[PDB]
Amino acid sequence: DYYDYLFKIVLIGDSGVGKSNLLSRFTRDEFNLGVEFATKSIQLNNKIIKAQIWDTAITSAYYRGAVGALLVYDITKKNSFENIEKWLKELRDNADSNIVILLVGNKSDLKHLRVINDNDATQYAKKEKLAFIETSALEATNVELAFHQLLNEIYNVRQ
Numbered sequence: 001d002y003y004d005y006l007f008k009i010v011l012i013g014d015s016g017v018g019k020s021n022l023l024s025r026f027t028r029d030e031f032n033l034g035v036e037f038a039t040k041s042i043q044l045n046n047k048i049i050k051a052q053i054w055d056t057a058i059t060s061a062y063y064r065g066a067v068g069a070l071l072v073y074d075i076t077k078k079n080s081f082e083n084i085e086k087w088l089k090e091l092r093d094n095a096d097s098n099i100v101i102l103l104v105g106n107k108s109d110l111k112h113l114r115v116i117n118d119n120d121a122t123q124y125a126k127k128e129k130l131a132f133i134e135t136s137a138l139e140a141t142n143v144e145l146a147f148h149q150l151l152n153e154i155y156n157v158r159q
Ligand SMILES: Nc1nc2c(ncn2[C@@H]2O[C@H](COP(=O)(O)OP(=O)(O)O)[C@@H](O)[C@H]2O)c(=O)[nH]1
Pocket: 014, 015, 016, 017, 018, 019, 020, 021, 022, 032, 033, 106, 107, 108, 109, 110, 135, 136, 137, 138, 139
């Protein structure tokens, strides 16, 4: 270590969408076919940020101190996208008002099984005033893009 800043980030969404593998891809560049956390440091002006990222298999305790979150669904499972409103609600009830939130559609490699079209997801994100990006934890597609967008925006909000 040295790190100038510790940013707590929470992953939230239905079981089976890819949260634990988003965590393992970003922090240790690995994929696998109660509550846990992992860390990874990035550098900007030479300023070093330690991302402390969480997921679950304590709601007040889980959200406390979080400065960012990824809201995650599965682009192949309609129910996971419908359930995003509920997870956003739980987040709003329990998180700091200045928390930075990003919508993520995972499993983008399952091209032929898509049920959620990207314009419909973008429409929802804009309504909730969030950025939206599609990822593949399996193929690594856009994983660094999603986490770095989140971390740089938290730094800007903080500064
Ligand atoms: N094809 C594909 N499968 C994935 C992807 N991400 C996760 N999975 C698989 O989907 C299942 C659930 O993922 P997991 O990380 O355990 O979901 P969680 O319950 O949200 O933590 C596992 O069998 C993963 O290997 C992905 O991007 N593409």
